[PDB]
Scaffold this active site. Structure first.
Site, short mmCIF file in Angstrom:
data_model
loop_
_atom_site.label_atom_id
_atom_site.label_comp_id
_atom_site.label_asym_id
_atom_site.label_seq_id
_atom_site.Cartn_x
_atom_site.Cartn_y
_atom_site.Cartn_z
N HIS A 41 0.82 -1.22 0.00
CA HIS A 41 0.00 0.00 0.00
C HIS A 41 0.87 1.30 0.00
CE1 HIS A 41 -0.06 -0.31 4.52
NE2 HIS A 41 0.25 0.97 4.38
N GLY A 143 2.16 5.85 9.99
CA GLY A 143 3.58 5.76 9.67
C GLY A 143 4.24 4.49 10.19
N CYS A 145 3.36 1.41 9.53
CA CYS A 145 3.25 0.32 8.55
C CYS A 145 4.63 -0.12 8.09
CB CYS A 145 2.37 0.72 7.37
SG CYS A 145 0.69 1.19 7.83
O1 LIG Z 1 -4.36 1.43 8.67
C1 LIG Z 1 -3.50 2.15 8.18
C2 LIG Z 1 -3.55 2.56 6.72
C3 LIG Z 1 -4.28 1.55 5.87
C4 LIG Z 1 -5.61 1.74 5.52
C5 LIG Z 1 -6.32 0.75 4.85
C6 LIG Z 1 -5.69 -0.44 4.50
C7 LIG Z 1 -4.35 -0.59 4.80
CL1 LIG Z 1 -3.50 -2.00 4.22
C8 LIG Z 1 -3.64 0.38 5.48
N1 LIG Z 1 -2.48 2.67 8.89
C9 LIG Z 1 -2.25 2.55 10.27
C10 LIG Z 1 -1.71 1.40 10.86
N2 LIG Z 1 -1.60 1.20 12.17
C11 LIG Z 1 -2.01 2.18 12.98
C12 LIG Z 1 -2.55 3.42 12.53
C13 LIG Z 1 -2.96 4.49 13.37
N3 LIG Z 1 -3.45 5.64 12.92
C14 LIG Z 1 -3.58 5.78 11.59
C15 LIG Z 1 -3.22 4.83 10.68
C16 LIG Z 1 -2.68 3.61 11.13
#
Ligand SMILES: O=C(Cc1cccc(Cl)c1)Nc1cncc2cnccc12
Ligand SMILES: O=C(Cc1cccc(Cl)c1)Nc1cncc2cnccc12
EC number: 3.4.19.12
Lengths: 304, 304
Positions: A41, A143, A145
């Site tokens: 992503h 951030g 990820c």
């Molecule tokens: O969830 C996502 C972005 C996302 C959206 C849809 C699909 C996928 Cl593969 C990834 N990022 C985050 C990860 N962990 C924790 C967070 C905490 N706050 C914001 C964002 C976070």
């Protein structure tokens, strides 16, 4: 003595963390040998995260669009490919800090350490478990990820998790290092059902043995039970069914304490039926399930 | 989202760990620049641990009696001195992996990460706090002495603790990196009183703000209190008195959530007087006190 939620030393993993940027999106990457692994992503904008066709999106990207930075130095990208939900960026330099490593897909109930990272820089390390519903209860901000989960055996790092997503419930979903998500999750900005999260029964029993080893014995009772009687209680309290495989892995802890596994099950049955009555076990007022039998033995023996 | 007992990444500290042996005793040492720091009880046998005269014992030791091993390579000891309860072994080589560092003496209530080590090899990392009674609730087995506690600010490691002893109660006592014990403890095999261990009130309030930030809000009430009214409750429940200094440090968390510090105190007062009624806060059934306001902000902001 003492019992703590202990993570593996993260140094071997810190030396692999890099920053990957594509377009306006920056996340973490894992540099092992001449390959950088990151969530696919990274090629998405917030707009196409709603329904992304990763194959069509990756067609618009070239090696020069993936900016990989290791500390303050730039890596030259000479190849890119997508494997499931991860991108593999071939770089022209092998990571000089690459430890001995393996990619492993863990089973639910297994534990691992997470090195949370932001912009390719490590912020902290914590221990967690793959839940029976294939989510992890992590601590991750935007951030994070590309941050990885791992286990260490002597000098070998077994990478088991790569963080990709936070569900609307605040729990986390990710992949193994081959890019296959744990559970039914897809890398899309759509609400996704986590599923019922049960308690990891074998781990609670391992932690009860850890408690006895470290002196907390108030919960030990004069009773015993059978696997079938115990499992009726486990079903009622949303605990995973205990099998002879679980009893077998609890063998070393049963031998260390002299408490038969089914006797410890009867202690757990009574704790489930009666609660803790305001008491604690290993500094906790609830039954802990994120220590496996291996973790308890490792912590109580001192494996380095 | 998510909140975890998170330790600092331990890599910078792993590169400093060495094995120190004197006679038949082996423990851990900390190699920074050309000095190896270790607990002075490394010169003792079990027999003289009952009442050791460290000055008289050190007179029988020469530089060649201190065996310092970094990984698999031996360090040449060119000097030895005792500073309080630590020995400083001057070696002929500066540690090439010495990070930017400082020695700091922490205040009770402050937190730090511990890299538990055995035979100079790191086994795990966990977060803990200096208790108001100057003990730490660690996880340490025989051979863990010399393992260090630390904090990290960007690239600088502030070493704050060196493990020396386990009390008969299973709690841990140690020194700062100048060899001064935290609390009244002496490095002798004699039963020693730890003292009453109170709850770190400012840290519980910080963790309650962490809970609100991450979605757990059930405990928020329609009440407020004053510092004096709150402290009457804190005294009754063996909580540290809250001062305006504590209220001032909770400012950023109060601003982040819009919950005035005294309103959060009223939530804490009600939780102390009524218990949790079988509910949880951040996956815990008790009030957590080993997260400082700084820790909560760092974890909830992503400082690397
Ligand atoms: O969830 C996502 C972005 C996302 C959206 C849809 C699909 C996928 Cl593969 C990834 N990022 C985050 C990860 N962990 C924790 C967070 C905490 N706050 C914001 C964002 C976070
Ligand atoms: O407590 C001691 C030895 C000792 C005795 C008297 C005084 C002093 Cl300075 C040191 N070592 C240990 C430390 N932490 C944890 C342990 C667990 N098991 C055994 C031993 C442990």
């Amino acid at each position: 003595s003492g019992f703590r939620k202990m993570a593996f030393p993260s140094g071997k993993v810190e030396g692999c963390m890099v920053q990957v940027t594509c377009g306006t999106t920056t996340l973490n990457g894992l540099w092992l040998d001449d390959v950088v692994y990151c969530p696919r992503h990274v090629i998405c904008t917030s707009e196409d995260m709603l329904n992304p066709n990763y194959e069509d999106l990756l067609i618009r990207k070239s090696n020069h669009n993936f900016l990989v930075q290791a500390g303050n130095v730039q890596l030259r990208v000479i190849g890119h490919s997508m494997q499931n939900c991860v991108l593999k960026l071939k770089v022209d330099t092998a990571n000089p800090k690459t430890p001995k490593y393996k990619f492993v897909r863990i089973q639910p109930g297994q534990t691992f350490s997470v090195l949370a990272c932001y912009n390719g820089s490590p912020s902290g390390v914590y221990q967690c478990a793959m839940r029976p519903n294939f989510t992890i209860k992590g601590s991750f901000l935007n951030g994070s990820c590309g941050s990885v989960g791992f286990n260490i055996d002597y000098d070998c790092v077994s990478f088991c998790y790569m963080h990709h997503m936070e569900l609307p419930t605040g729990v986390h979903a990710g992949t193994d290092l081959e890019g296959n998500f744990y559970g039914p999750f897809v890398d899309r900005q759509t609400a996704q059902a986590a599923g019922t999260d049960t308690t990891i029964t074998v781990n609670v029993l391992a932690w009860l043995y850890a408690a006895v080893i470290n002196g907390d014995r108030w919960f030990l009772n004069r009773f015993t039970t059978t696997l079938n009687d115990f499992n009726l209680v486990a079903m009622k309290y949303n605990y995973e069914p205990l099998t002879q495989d679980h009893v077998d892995i609890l063998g070393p802890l049963s031998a260390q304490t002299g408490i038969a596994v089914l006797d410890m099950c009867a202690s757990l049955k009574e704790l489930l039926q009666n609660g803790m009555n305001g008491r604690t076990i290993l500094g906790s007022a609830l039954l802990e399930d994120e220590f496996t039998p291996f973790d308890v033995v490792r912590q109580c023996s001192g494996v380095t």
